[PDB]
Every structure is written in structure tokens, then in C-alpha cells.
RNA sequence: UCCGUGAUAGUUUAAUGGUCAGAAUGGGCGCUUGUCGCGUGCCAGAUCGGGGUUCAAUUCCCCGUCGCGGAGCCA
RNA sequence: AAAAGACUUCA
RNA sequence: GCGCGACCCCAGGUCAGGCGGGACUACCGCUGAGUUUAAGCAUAUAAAUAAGCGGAGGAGAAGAAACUUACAAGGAUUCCC
RNA sequence: UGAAACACGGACCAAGGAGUCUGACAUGCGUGCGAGUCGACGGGUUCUGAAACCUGGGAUGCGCAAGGAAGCUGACGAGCGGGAGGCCCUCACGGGCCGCACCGCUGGCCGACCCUGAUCUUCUGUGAAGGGUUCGAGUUGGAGCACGCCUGUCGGGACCCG
RNA sequence: GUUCGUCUGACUUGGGUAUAGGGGCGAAAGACUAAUCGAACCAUCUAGUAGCUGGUUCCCUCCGAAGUUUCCCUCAGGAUAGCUGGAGCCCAUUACGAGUUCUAUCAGGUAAAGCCAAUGAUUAGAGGCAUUGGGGACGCAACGUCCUCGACCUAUUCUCAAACUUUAAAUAGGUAGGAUGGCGCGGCUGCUUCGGUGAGCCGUGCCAUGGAAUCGGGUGCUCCAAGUGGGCCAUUUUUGGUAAGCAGAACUGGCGAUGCGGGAUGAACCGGAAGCCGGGUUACGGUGCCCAACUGCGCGCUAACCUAGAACCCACAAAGGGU
RNA sequence: CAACUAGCCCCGAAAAUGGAUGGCGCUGAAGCGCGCGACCCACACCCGGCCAUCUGGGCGAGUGCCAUGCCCCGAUGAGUA
RNA sequence: UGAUUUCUGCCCAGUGCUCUGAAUGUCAAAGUGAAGAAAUUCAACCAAGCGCGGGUAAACGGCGGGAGUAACUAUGACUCUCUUAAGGUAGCCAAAUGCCUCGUCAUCUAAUUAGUGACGCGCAUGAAUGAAUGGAUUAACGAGAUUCCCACUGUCCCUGUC
RNA sequence: CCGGGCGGAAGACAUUGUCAGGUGGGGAGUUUGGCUGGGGCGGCCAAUCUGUUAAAAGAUAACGCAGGUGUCCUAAGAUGAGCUCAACGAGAACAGAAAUCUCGUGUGGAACAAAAGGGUAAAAGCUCGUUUGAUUCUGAUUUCCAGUACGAAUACGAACCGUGAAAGCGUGGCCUAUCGAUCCUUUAGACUUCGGAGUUUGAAGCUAGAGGUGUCAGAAAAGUUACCACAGGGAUUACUGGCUUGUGGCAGCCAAGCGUUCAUAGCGACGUUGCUUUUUGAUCCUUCGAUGUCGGCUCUUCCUAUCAUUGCGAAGCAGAAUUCACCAAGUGUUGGAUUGUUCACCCACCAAUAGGGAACGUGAGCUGGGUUUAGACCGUCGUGAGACAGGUUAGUUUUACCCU
């Protein structure tokens, strides 16, 4: 049989873990008291701080107002066109301007948003990677449901109470243009949780990996293995609908 | 193997006939269940579902050669006695006739 | 070479369960056609040599010739 | 409408 | 509200006192192999053993039958034959 | 197979150093007692781990044969041939008589198995009686048991070492 | 040591810190993880197992093997039988027994022979013979004729056979040659006889050296156990193979379990099995000297410059040539 | 004169560390074939002495006692496991 | 799989994989109903799985053979016929891949089984098993493999001396 | 202002627990014959049969010879009666070489399922008739042989049947091959037991059959290892040496021919006799608790079947090239190109560029290029791991001071 393979090593341990501590802080969205007809929770952009933990920025929005139980501060996700000293409004009756976060119901149909909540208060689930955005496809006067076409292309039923931020997320185009070094690739992966070089299954020994062994270079068997297959067995292209190079599409639900 | 008539006369062992009389050949086989058998032994000593001595499957215990597999069943007391060793393969029966030899057309 | 595997009409290759063998194409013959061709009707086997078994062998064995493949170490 | 192809030299 | 008693639930470097670890020969539980044997090896054997872990005493466990029996019935428990 | 071996080990020497011990077994041999035998779990007792004494036994045997239920229930009781030795006769050679050990053989009897099934009888029991190419570690005129030693045998680390 | 790769980055390197054994880590070599890595090291289970290698400890006596049969995941080993010893058990020249011969009588298909005996192979002719194998010539034709070539047929002829044999040896092999026998007498049976007819088995009587030869410094019998379970060689017989100091059988003797003497020398060949000695006498093989012993006698042969010759096995050797 | 028969010698007959009737050497042999005597000669054979073993005897009637002793026999004895 | 440039053809039969597919088949337990005094027995239902259908090769991989046919000749553009899942296309090739093989040849050297470029029916090449990189004397980078030239030198002729 | 349901989502769904089916090299444990001229590849000589080998009783082997066996049959069994065949000749509309019919002759030359070999004639064949013993019981006996099991065979008994006039014969096939433990199940026997007593289901027994192990006296089993490990082995390979000399090399005999003529100057068919180990196998004798592979580099000795040179004999030797034979290893027998290759093949010299051996001379003398480890690439084969008598590259050469 064989020695245990590299995926199972995730587990726990500092060696497989990243420096999550170095990362600059919470990405959280401050949970609305009530109201917010322009500036009842007023944020001031004072910096746009780079996050090393995803290599794209979150705008530092500083809410500062006192009381004692007032909860405030820290990083809302950056959108395009935001500037320092511009005010950010967070809540129900907020004005429709880019960078403001408000329930999706009050945002009109056909409107580009970044971040959505996959149930209220989970703070940002859909579209967070750069140059991506969801577009809210349908509403109607529907109390129950706001329908959003996601960047995956899926049409999703999600509650109308769920907050979204106007605009698209910033730092777009990031992945599109090529690294042009192995060394540039190393630096990005080092800062995030990934081990950098990919050794091929063929190059590994038969003990370590199913595809290993053989005098000449080859994968011995069919790459495609079942989804129902257990851990250890489940390798290669898992449950591929098709292979070889042509004519697919994005996730395409119908309603 | 061979067509051998379904109607033959043969001895009765039993003591109310105890002579040759007509008998109609038909096979009777059944099989087991009642739990009192091998199956109780299997239940106890499987011991995590390990099959053990239930497998003689590989190295063939399957060949196409049998012996006689006949019991000729009496129509005069219905008690009947088994016949001794002879060679078969299959065994032809159908309600017989003869398998009459000498063909003109 | 050892262990396998075939051969059947001019050519290329189907088939049988023991009594019995085909197709296609080529060719040979008319017809189509100004005239050939396409098309259209007609036609034609040592089932390798070889013995045996068997009522009866193209068919089921055995041998051999030829033509093939595939194996043959520590080399 | 699709079944319609060839066809020696001096000429 | 304050609810005498109290009800229910918290807190004392709280009043008088108590627990851990050891020993672990022997003992009482728990939990648990394989070599080996089968001239191979899995069922089985080793063994309900070794290893692992906890807990007492000078002994410990057991203990007055929801027993054994099929008899003019034996009669808690233990050990030996 | 063959070691001087161009097989293998061994510079030399001292001292260690390997078929043992046991439980349960077979044979042999010895000892006791003997249709019994075996004290020692135990108790009595003591000069004190002893020795002495003693109990009912229990174990094994004295009858078996079946898978089991069980078995008229195993007591009628045996011949023949070669037989040591003795006896008798004969001077002896031999003859006759009795014949053991032991061996071979032919029967009867018992159980299991199969037939046979009287008189009787709580109604299917009964088992006189006559048999059988079946079969038994039986009876047909038992021998064991205890102890010990060698050697064999098995479990044990098990001749020693890997 | 020299020579040399890199030397501002996927750089170098320390400390602190994380990941531990079917686990880690790996820019991946099964590499490395404290001189330790195709699963670390340590202790324990464990005094683990191993048909296999090594070693296995005082003496003398007497007897004394076998590598074979049968079964086996068995062919490096067990069971099994045999051989071998022990303990005996029973008689004792009575008795019967025998790797033996004779006699008398069976069985046998090898050597060989045979083929004009059957079967199979196979050579050569010769001579016949056709209502239908083929040609030609003579013919109108023929129930015509003649040549020709084939078949066949007949008497010959030639040579062979493990899987041919009528035939058919030798050496081998079996049985018998008596008291464990014969005969007389007279009993029983469900057998057998249409019948006491017969068969078998019982009691009783008669007949000895007497049933060819020879031997039994005795034999017969029972229990139990060790070792062996790889054999090897020579003469003879023999299968495969060009052959082989080869592989495999048949018979026997050896070696193994064998020195001594001989073959210069040699585990197996030759001679002979070996207590301890003196004296004698031999075997094998020798007698010129080595080397104990006739340079003895007798009668021949041999002159070898292209290898004089000189003791079975055995250390090689041929066709063919010589005035 | 020719063809043969078969003796020895010659040829055929050429290998490597130098070399082997074992050696020296041997020519009316010490060669080769053969005969005849004499002779030499194994742990063999014989005779005698002697050992143990085996076999058959024998001698205890006590009061010299090994009586499993002592004494007479004859044959036999290699010896691995 | 291995920079770029460029191009990545054919085949889902097989082994895998996939699915809003299968339509109720096969099909487990619990559960359900019937019989039997019951133990129990039988029936139907029975998911997932299986069977069935579709999709899938930058998944693994695979990617034919016989003949005939050009007016010297040979060869076959041409065409047949069988057969398969599909019949190797673009390319590269006696190549670190060619047994035969030192293939035939233009090649450098006197002489080259080594190197190059053709041909290549290629024993047994080939398209992310990744192929090629715009005639070429086809550049770059390498303690790489290979070959040839020039400088250089005791590597050698032929050795010597310190 | 009032409401102790923090506030949302989700909601008897998920979840969780326990059985149940599936899946599961991911991980576990384990296995992956023997005979065998090493062992693998291959084959079955693995359980069996026929004739022969097998050397005339018997026993009797080899991966000895020529083959065969996992079947076939309600008759191809059993029994009786009838009949006689293979073949050939001579005849007979059609009909020839073979049709069907007839007679003679006809020892078996046929037929009896099959492999082969026996045997057999008023049959065992062939044909007809009647049939079902191819039956029931349980021993003995013969083979294999431990004088065992098992199978199969023999002949009886005890039953009951069958056939035929009956006497008789019949326990499968004319004889020699054609088959199978305990377990477990299944079937039959109405018997026993289910143990506190019964009754009834069910179950378990005993006796005789069936379902079967072909490694066939009867484990439950697939690969790879050049990443390998360990116990042993020269019982055994690859390598040296030794025996052998088919295969290889060298040398003869005979002489039909060739050579203008003319067998033999020089050659020499068809054959045939030697020698050598300078080819390679065969073998397993010796060595695997250890004899360092191949080539080259270097250096020696020897061998002659002598290429040259010395000195000679032949000639189809006129001269001269050249060819043959003799004594002879005294003395020479070469450099390069390429390949690890010795060998090979060229260039070029030359009097000549002979051939062989010495542990396939030559590694504590070297080199380490080949072969032949661990890295790796490609192709092929393989599901894979891996393999490759296919290619390709890089890869540790230890110790003499002892004795001669």
C-alpha cells in the first residue's frame, strides 16, 4: 500500500498553517443600530490599507463615535472610486452612492454590487475576489426573496434583508497579467496559506502517490475518480462532467 | 448424458412390496434453512464478518461431470430406493420415448 | 529456432452443427450507348498437400510445407 | 429539377 | 420591591475536617497485542496472556440464593481432592 | 559420494561451555501387593518443612458393546494339531498316557447389526427357539495397580547457538 | 591539495519557535529525520521462530546399517515399510529351514532366427493372365489377330524390424520330492446326491528313518526403539545423447563403513576384509639398480634423425602406406 | 617373378611452465612375445603362545569368604551412522 | 505539461469518470401483509448500488492488412477488397528512440562503426506520453552529452634532469 | 408605551447515535505450487490408460518412444434364437471404378463407442425377438500395496427379478483408462435423542446414496523488487580449470573431374580417417562462511600447424613476379582512422606485417571505457509496480612491512 499523501497533512500544525497574525485585521461589517438616513453612523475613510492576506485592499473606515456600547472601527471592503475624507454610510435608509452598504431590497434591480450576505450578519460571501462583482438580477415587490446573479453566473435566492455594498471590489485585473517569474509566484504564495512548488504525481514514487512508478513517464490509470470514492482513493479530476478542451460555459441555472 | 426411460421397473426395499414393480424417475432436491446447521457456526465464528471456511470458491469445485443423480419413485408404495454409482455428465429425460436408433430418412 | 496462428473462385476474404460452400470485385457475354464508361440483366471453385476417424469430412483430429506474429534470463 | 464523367494526330 | 421562616441559585485566603502521589510482590477492576502454533496462512491458536491505565488492604475479591437439582432432595461465599 | 584438499573453521593457552529437568505418555527392566490396588485432599501426632499413624474413599482395574436409547441381559460349557516336561511300558531304540508355556485353527455365548418370534401378556409388550459372506479394544476359565530407572513420545525456551 | 560552481538573491547564516515513527519533512534523491532510514533508535512481548550452517564434552567391549518402498505445497524434510540393535520368548539336532543343485514338471517371447510363414518394410528381374487402364499396326466388321506399355497373378530373388512373428535359445523364474503324509475302520450335514450317492470335518487303528543331494560351530518366534530417508563407483547388461569422469535404468560387487599388499602415485580397479605376537608359508605384483628378489636358464623378434620400446582399469590414438 | 597373410620397426603422429615405461638407464635388454625352474612376497593362510567375546562344560556339603567367583572348551573378533 | 513563437488532428469500443438522465427492473435492513398455536416460512415494497441510456482523450491510452494500377524500368499519385473503437494526420526520424546495422549515400579526416543532412514500409517515433521553431555555416544561457578546427602543451615520439 | 422569546437565519429538515446495503489498495493482514540435466521462459512426464523401452519370471526409470483420458451408449446393456464378415472373381435393365441383386471363394485380412494392443465366428460381431441385474444387502478377494485407503475389477453368499425350451447366464458396456476424505448440506430409512414429564412443530444423531476438491490421499491465494534483506547452497547458474569435441579450427586417405593435352605442377567432387581445443555448446566434477568479469595499456615465457629471413627440395619456375613442400621459434612480425570491443574494417609502410597458449596470461601493476548496482531520459512490452539478449548519460578500484 503506501505512505500518507500530502493533502491529509493540512490537519493542524504551524508548518501547514499561514501567518494569519501578520494579516491586518477584521473584514467585518458593523451591525446597524437602526435608521441611517444619511450619516447616523458616519465613517470617514482615513486610509486605504493593503491586506497581505489576499493581496488586495480593504478601505480603512474609522467610526469613532462614543457612548459605551457604541461598537465602531475598522476595515470595510474597498470599492472602486473611493477617496479619503469621503463619508461612508452603513445601514437601512442609506443614500445610493458607491462604497455605501445597505440592504439589497433598497438597491434597485440591475445594479452592480460587491459583497452580499448568505444570511444576515455573515458580512460578505459573494464576490470578494478582485475585479469580480455580482449584479442583482431580480426583486419585484418580493418580501421573501431578492435574486442575485453571482459572478459564478448562478441565480441565487437570498433574503431581501441581506446587505450588499454598491460598486465593484477594487484591485481588479490583478490575476490577468502574467507573473513572468517563478520567484514572483513564490512571494505571493508565501504570504498566504499555500506550499509553493507542485511536484507531479508521475514524478513521485508509487508508495507516495497512485500515479507514480513506471520506467517511462506516465500516469498509469484513468485520472478521473468517483466523487463517492473515499479519502485517499479520491484523486485526479474528481467527477469530471467532461474533459478535453471545448465548449463549456459558466454555471447556468434556469428559472 | 443419455436418454434413460422415465418408466422402469426396479426393486422396493420396504417390506410391503419387496419386489420389482413400476417406478417413475424424478429428482427431488431441496436445500437447507432452519438455522440448526452450518449457519449457526458461521454466525458465531465469522467474528467481524470474516467468511472463513465458507470459501472453497477458487480452484474449481465446478466440473461438468456428475454421476447418476437418480431416484426412481414407486407407484405402489411411494417409498423408493436410490441406485448405485454410474457416470453421467448432464442427464437427459423429458418423459422419454426411447431415443430409437436406425434411421431410414 | 521454441510456443502459438492461418490458408476457401482470377483477387480479397465470409461459413458448417458431418452428409450441404458464399458474397464483393475482376473477367468473359448481351443491353445500355455517337463511342467507352457508370448503370442494367447473365455466368465461373484443388475449400493447402497429406493420411485417419467416420455411413458420409470443406467441416473433426494428426503430420508436413509456406507465409505470419509473440516469447526466449544471470547476456 | 440533381443521374449525366471521359473521349488520339494532321485538323 | 422589601417576599420573617423559606423557596431557587450563587460567593468566601470561610468554620471543623477530607482528596490527588506512592506501593503496585500479591490482589480487585479496566483495556488489550503479536511473535508463536497450525511444518504455509486468514477462522482458530498464543490469550480473554504480555504491554497500556486506575484503586485498596494485610489479605483482597466473594457472600446468605430470582442457586443446584429431579432426590427418604442438596443448600451463602472460598480453596484443595 | 569423496576433505590433504586451490572446501569451511581454527595464532597459542587457561577458565567457562551444549540431550537437561518436569507433567502426561509407550515399551523394557526391577520392587511391592494382588481382584484388588493406590498412606500423605485431609485428620491424628511430632524429636518437627520430616518421620510415624489412620479415614472414608476418590482414581484406575476387576466385562462389555453401541451414535444413542439400551441391551433374554455376557454362567450350560469347548474341540483339534504341533507342544516342553512328567507318567507308564521297554535293557535301550522306541511305543503308549497326561499334556504346560506358546502357536495356529474350528466352534458356541454377549453387544452393536440382521433374520427367527413358542408358551405367556397392563393391548404390544414377551424372547423360549433356530440362524447369519456383517462388526467389537468382549466371555469361552481375568491382571492389574502403585512406585522407580533407562530409552522412546508430546507440551514446555527443550541438545546448544543463530 | 590543485582545478573549480555560486556570490544581492528562489541569497547566506545564528538564536528562539513548530512538525515525531506507517509518522514527519521533502524545489522529490526513497532522500533525510543526532556516525542510525525501502519505515529511526530504545526497552519489552522475547529465552520468539528457522526442515537449514556451525559446535555438541571420559574409556573399553560386542553386534552393526542405509541413501531404498509408499504418501506428502513433497523432491534440503517428515510419516510409512525395510535394513540395524536391544529386551527377550520357545525348543534344540528332536524340528523344520535354505540368495543351492539335482530330479521331474510348469511358465516365458529376450538373444537369435525368419520373410518364397502371417503383419510391416524392401530390391531385382522372369514367366503368365483381361468381356472393358492406356497406346499404335493389321483390318468394313467380329464372341478378331499381333506388337507395346501398365496393373495384377505365379514361381523366384534380395535385405531388414523396439513398438512383427508361426517359430525360438542360454543365464534367470515357479512348484513338487511325504508322519504338517498316506491308508483302513466307522460317524454327521440344513450340503451334495432323483439314491448314503458324494464331499468336507471329527473318534479309533496301521506304516520310520522313509522317501533326491547337501548343510544348519543351532533354529524358530514376539515386542520395542535408534539411524537411514541427498548416495557414489567398477565389471557386465542397457535407454537417451556426437560424446562425456554425462543424465537415466537392469543385475551384482565395492566405496560409502577399507586399511594392509599390488597397480610408481590414485576413496571405488587387482589380491584379500584387519585381535595381539613369534616362527613358517603365499596372493596380487615382481626379481639390472632404485626396491625385498635369478645381470637365471631357454627360443624367437626389434636397429627406430623426425616421437625406439616397456604391464588390465590407465593416462589416448586411426584410416592408409613401406623392395 | 607377382599377389597376399601377419609380426616388430618406420611413416601417418603437430601445443603451449622443462618431463616423465615413476626414475636411472637398458640393444645375444633390464626391450618385446613366449617357455621352464628357482626365488622374492599382505594385518591373508598355517602352527604355537596369549587377550576379550561368544558357545559348551565343570567345580560349594559347610567351616576362607568375589560362586554376579574360579577352572577347563573350541570357534570367533575390521568397523562409520 | 513545462519559458516564448507555433501547432496540438483521429477514437468513449475498452479501463475510468459524469449526468436536471434510466422508470421502477434487479434490489438490504427496519417496516408491512398472509399462513402456521408459534418458532418460522412466503410475498410485495425496497433506497443507494447494479443493469440500461447519453456526455467525456491538454483522462489513461490506442491511432490496420492484403492485392492490382504509369507506354523502358522500377515505384505507386490512382483504385479495390476485407476488417476495427478508431485506423498515426501535422511533424520528427537509423534521432539520448532502427534489432538487422558499421543500412545506402553526399560529409569532415590518408583512413572516422563517432558527428551532420537526406532517404526511412520507422524491430518498437509522434502531437501537453507534448511535436516543431521561419534554407542555413539554425544566436542565447550550461563545472551537461557529443563532434570538428585552431592556439597550447612531455598525452605521445623518447625519454631525461633538477 | 407595552412585551423577559438577546437578535437573526434554519427548523422537526439537517444534526447526532445504532443497525442495514453499497463503496473503499486509501489503509490492514496475508498469500502468490512441484517435477525440473540451475531456475525462469516452455512443457505436464501433476491423478491416470495402450503397445514399446524393460536386457524372455517378477520388479523396472529418464522432460525415453508412438499416442490416448474429464467422454460415448436404453443399447453400443442383459439374455436367447437366427445369420456370417473384410475382400476378390464371375454374372445381372439402367449402373460407369463405386448403386442394387446373385453365387462361389473367403481365419477373420472386418466389425465389436473411443487411444492403442490383445481377444473373439453356428459369436461377444451383424440382424431379429423378448427385455431392464445399469437391481437390493453387506462381506471376502484382485490391483495400486504400508500387502493401506479410495476408485475400478473378480467370483460367491443372502435377497428379489429378467431372459431363454431349460440347463444356464446376468452385480453394466469384449478386456485393458473414464475419477474423489472428514466437515457441511442434500436424499432415504417413520429408528433414536432433544435430558425435570409428556404431546406436537422444528432440530440433532446412526446406516447407505448424491452435491467435490484435476497440485486429482483432498491448504483457502495475484503480481513486482537493478531499492532489496536474511538463512543456506558449489546439491546450482553466470566465470576460470577439467572430461567431451556435435558445432568450430587444422591436417590426411581415396580419386571422378578441372587444368590445351595429360586424374595427382597447382587443385580436387561424391565420400571417408585423424588431430586439436585457435569457435561454441553439452556437463555440473571443483569453488558461492568469496579463485576480482571484458578490453586496452605494459611486460615475459613458451608453442608450431612457419608469414618473413637463413639453407634447401617441386613447378604448366625462359627471365622475373608467383605458387608448393622441407629442416627450423635463431630472429623479426608494424603505425594510424573508428568502434569499450580483442575480433572487425580501412589507410599506409614493409623482408614480413603468420597463427596460438600461459586462471578466456596480465586490477594489493594501472586505467575503469564495456559488461553489471543505486540517479535519469527515450522507445517497446506491461492495468500497474516493474522489465528489456534495445538505446543513452553520470557514477568510491582498499591493504604487502610477513613468507617464498
Coordinates of N, CA and C (backbone and C1' of nucleotides) in Angstrom, one line a residue, chain A residues 1-5 119-120 159 206-207 210-221 228-233, chain J residues 7-10 22-30 376-388 390-391:
Chain A
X1 N 0.9 -1.2 0.0 CA 0.0 0.0 0.0 C 0.9 1.2 0.0
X2 N 0.8 2.1 1.0 CA 1.5 3.3 0.8 C 1.5 4.2 2.0
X3 N 2.5 5.1 2.1 CA 2.6 6.2 3.0 C 1.6 7.3 2.6
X4 N 1.1 8.0 3.6 CA 0.1 9.0 3.5 C 0.5 10.2 2.6
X5 N -0.5 10.7 1.8 CA -0.3 11.6 0.8 C -0.6 13.0 1.3
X119 N -27.0 35.1 4.4 CA -27.9 35.1 5.6 C -27.3 36.2 6.4
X120 N -28.1 37.1 7.0 CA -27.8 38.4 7.5 C -26.7 38.3 8.6
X159 N -32.3 36.2 1.2 CA -33.3 37.1 1.8 C -33.0 38.6 1.4
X206 N 5.7 5.3 -6.3 CA 4.5 4.5 -6.3 C 3.9 4.4 -4.9
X207 N 4.8 4.4 -3.9 CA 4.4 4.4 -2.5 C 3.7 5.6 -2.0
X210 N -0.5 7.4 -6.2 CA -1.0 6.3 -7.1 C -0.5 6.4 -8.5
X211 N -0.2 7.6 -9.0 CA 0.2 7.8 -10.4 C 1.6 7.6 -10.6
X212 N 2.4 7.5 -9.5 CA 3.9 7.3 -9.5 C 4.3 5.9 -10.0
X213 N 5.6 5.7 -10.2 CA 6.1 4.5 -10.7 C 6.1 4.4 -12.2
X214 N 6.6 3.3 -12.7 CA 6.7 3.1 -14.1 C 8.1 3.5 -14.6
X215 N 8.7 2.8 -15.5 CA 10.0 3.0 -16.1 C 10.0 4.3 -16.8
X216 N 9.1 4.5 -17.8 CA 8.9 5.7 -18.5 C 7.9 6.6 -17.7
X217 N 7.8 7.9 -18.1 CA 6.9 8.8 -17.5 C 5.5 8.6 -18.0
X218 N 4.6 8.3 -17.1 CA 3.2 8.2 -17.5 C 2.4 8.1 -16.2
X219 N 1.1 8.5 -16.3 CA 0.1 8.2 -15.3 C -0.5 6.9 -15.7
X220 N -0.5 5.9 -14.8 CA -0.7 4.5 -15.1 C -2.2 4.2 -15.4
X221 N -3.1 4.9 -14.8 CA -4.5 4.6 -14.9 C -5.3 5.9 -15.3
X228 N -17.9 9.8 -5.0 CA -18.3 8.9 -3.9 C -17.2 8.2 -3.3
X229 N -16.0 8.1 -4.0 CA -14.8 7.5 -3.6 C -14.3 8.1 -2.3
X230 N -13.7 7.3 -1.4 CA -13.4 7.7 0.0 C -12.1 8.6 -0.1
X231 N -11.8 9.3 1.0 CA -10.5 9.9 1.2 C -9.3 8.9 1.1
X232 N -8.4 9.3 0.2 CA -7.1 8.5 -0.1 C -7.2 8.0 -1.5
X233 N -8.4 7.5 -1.8 CA -8.7 7.0 -3.1 C -8.9 8.1 -4.1
Chain J
rG7 P -35.4 38.8 21.3 O5' -34.6 39.1 20.0 C5' -34.0 40.4 19.7 C4' -33.1 40.4 18.5 C3' -33.6 39.4 17.4 O3' -34.7 40.0 16.7 C1' -31.3 39.1 17.7
rG8 P -35.7 39.2 15.8 O5' -34.7 38.9 14.6 C5' -34.8 37.7 13.9 C4' -33.6 37.7 12.9 C3' -33.5 36.4 12.1 O3' -34.4 36.5 11.0 C1' -31.5 36.8 13.0
rA9 P -35.5 35.4 10.7 O5' -34.6 34.3 9.9 C5' -33.9 34.7 8.7 C4' -32.7 33.7 8.5 C3' -33.1 32.2 8.4 O3' -33.6 31.9 7.1 C1' -31.2 32.5 9.8
rA10 P -35.0 31.2 6.9 O5' -34.6 29.7 7.2 C5' -33.5 29.0 6.6 C4' -33.1 27.8 7.3 C3' -34.2 26.9 7.9 O3' -34.7 26.1 6.8 C1' -32.7 27.3 9.6
rG22 P -23.5 -5.3 0.3 O5' -23.3 -3.9 -0.4 C5' -23.8 -3.7 -1.8 C4' -23.5 -2.3 -2.3 C3' -22.0 -1.9 -2.4 O3' -21.6 -2.4 -3.7 C1' -23.2 -0.2 -1.3
rU23 P -20.1 -2.9 -3.9 O5' -19.3 -1.5 -3.6 C5' -19.3 -0.5 -4.6 C4' -18.7 0.8 -4.1 C3' -17.2 0.6 -3.7 O3' -16.4 0.7 -4.9 C1' -18.4 1.6 -2.0
rG24 P -15.1 -0.2 -5.0 O5' -14.2 0.3 -3.8 C5' -13.7 1.7 -3.9 C4' -13.0 2.0 -2.6 C3' -11.9 1.0 -2.1 O3' -10.7 1.3 -2.8 C1' -13.4 1.5 -0.3
rG25 P -10.2 0.5 -4.0 O5' -8.7 0.2 -3.4 C5' -7.5 0.3 -4.2 C4' -6.4 0.9 -3.3 C3' -5.0 1.1 -3.9 O3' -4.3 2.2 -3.4 C1' -5.0 -0.5 -2.2
rG26 P -4.6 3.7 -3.8 O5' -5.0 4.2 -2.3 C5' -4.7 5.4 -1.9 C4' -5.2 5.7 -0.5 C3' -4.7 4.7 0.5 O3' -3.4 5.2 0.9 C1' -7.0 4.8 0.8
rG27 P -2.2 4.3 1.2 O5' -2.7 3.4 2.5 C5' -2.6 4.0 3.8 C4' -3.4 3.1 4.8 C3' -3.0 1.6 5.0 O3' -1.9 1.6 5.9 C1' -5.3 1.7 4.8
rA28 P -1.0 0.2 5.9 O5' -2.0 -0.9 6.4 C5' -2.3 -1.0 7.8 C4' -3.1 -2.2 8.1 C3' -2.5 -3.6 7.7 O3' -1.4 -3.9 8.6 C1' -4.8 -3.6 7.3
rG29 P -0.1 -4.6 8.1 O5' -0.4 -6.1 8.1 C5' -0.8 -6.7 9.3 C4' -1.6 -8.0 9.0 C3' -0.9 -8.9 8.0 O3' 0.1 -9.7 8.6 C1' -3.2 -8.6 7.5
rU30 P 1.3 -10.1 7.8 O5' 0.8 -11.2 6.8 C5' 0.2 -12.4 7.3 C4' -0.6 -13.1 6.2 C3' 0.2 -13.4 4.9 O3' 1.0 -14.6 5.1 C1' -1.8 -12.5 4.3
rA376 P 15.4 8.3 -10.5 O5' 15.8 8.8 -11.9 C5' 15.8 10.2 -12.2 C4' 16.4 10.6 -13.5 C3' 15.7 10.0 -14.7 O3' 14.5 10.7 -15.0 C1' 18.0 9.6 -15.0
rC377 P 13.3 10.0 -15.7 O5' 13.6 10.3 -17.2 C5' 13.9 11.6 -17.7 C4' 14.4 11.6 -19.1 C3' 13.6 10.6 -20.1 O3' 12.5 11.3 -20.5 C1' 15.9 10.2 -20.3
rC378 P 11.1 10.5 -20.7 O5' 11.5 9.7 -22.1 C5' 11.6 10.5 -23.3 C4' 12.2 9.6 -24.4 C3' 11.3 8.4 -24.7 O3' 10.1 8.8 -25.5 C1' 13.5 7.8 -24.6
rG379 P 8.8 8.0 -25.4 O5' 9.1 6.7 -26.1 C5' 9.4 6.7 -27.5 C4' 9.8 5.4 -28.0 C3' 8.9 4.2 -27.7 O3' 7.8 4.1 -28.6 C1' 11.2 3.6 -27.2
rU380 P 6.4 3.5 -28.1 O5' 6.7 2.0 -27.9 C5' 7.0 1.2 -29.0 C4' 7.4 -0.3 -28.5 C3' 6.5 -1.0 -27.5 O3' 5.4 -1.6 -28.3 C1' 8.7 -1.1 -26.7
rC381 P 4.1 -1.8 -27.5 O5' 4.4 -2.8 -26.4 C5' 4.6 -4.2 -26.8 C4' 4.9 -5.0 -25.5 C3' 3.9 -4.8 -24.3 O3' 2.8 -5.6 -24.6 C1' 6.1 -4.6 -23.5
rG382 P 1.4 -5.0 -24.1 O5' 1.5 -5.0 -22.5 C5' 1.4 -6.2 -21.8 C4' 1.7 -5.8 -20.3 C3' 0.8 -4.8 -19.6 O3' -0.4 -5.4 -19.3 C1' 3.1 -4.3 -19.1
rU383 P -1.8 -4.6 -19.7 O5' -1.7 -3.3 -18.9 C5' -2.6 -2.2 -19.3 C4' -3.1 -1.5 -18.0 C3' -2.1 -1.1 -17.0 O3' -1.5 0.1 -17.4 C1' -3.8 -2.2 -15.8
rG384 P 0.1 0.2 -17.5 O5' 0.5 0.1 -16.0 C5' 0.0 1.2 -15.1 C4' 0.1 0.7 -13.7 C3' 1.5 0.5 -13.1 O3' 2.0 1.7 -12.7 C1' 0.3 -1.3 -12.6
rA385 P 3.4 2.1 -13.2 O5' 4.4 1.2 -12.2 C5' 4.4 1.5 -10.8 C4' 4.8 0.4 -9.8 C3' 6.2 -0.1 -10.0 O3' 7.2 0.8 -9.3 C1' 4.7 -1.9 -9.8
rG386 P 8.7 0.9 -9.7 O5' 9.1 -0.6 -9.7 C5' 10.2 -1.0 -10.6 C4' 9.9 -2.4 -11.2 C3' 10.7 -2.8 -12.3 O3' 11.9 -3.5 -11.9 C1' 8.5 -3.0 -13.0
rA387 P 13.3 -3.4 -12.7 O5' 12.9 -4.2 -14.0 C5' 12.8 -5.6 -13.9 C4' 12.3 -6.2 -15.3 C3' 13.2 -6.0 -16.5 O3' 14.3 -6.9 -16.5 C1' 11.0 -5.4 -17.1
rC388 P 15.7 -6.4 -17.0 O5' 15.5 -6.3 -18.5 C5' 15.2 -7.4 -19.4 C4' 15.1 -7.0 -20.8 C3' 16.2 -6.1 -21.4 O3' 17.2 -6.9 -21.9 C1' 14.1 -5.1 -21.8
rG390 P 18.6 -7.4 -28.1 O5' 18.1 -6.3 -27.0 C5' 19.0 -5.2 -26.7 C4' 18.6 -4.0 -27.5 C3' 19.3 -2.7 -27.0 O3' 20.6 -2.8 -27.6 C1' 17.1 -2.2 -27.1
rG391 P 21.8 -2.0 -26.9 O5' 21.3 -0.5 -27.1 C5' 21.7 0.2 -28.3 C4' 21.0 1.6 -28.2 C3' 21.7 2.6 -27.3 O3' 22.9 3.1 -27.9 C1' 19.4 2.7 -26.9

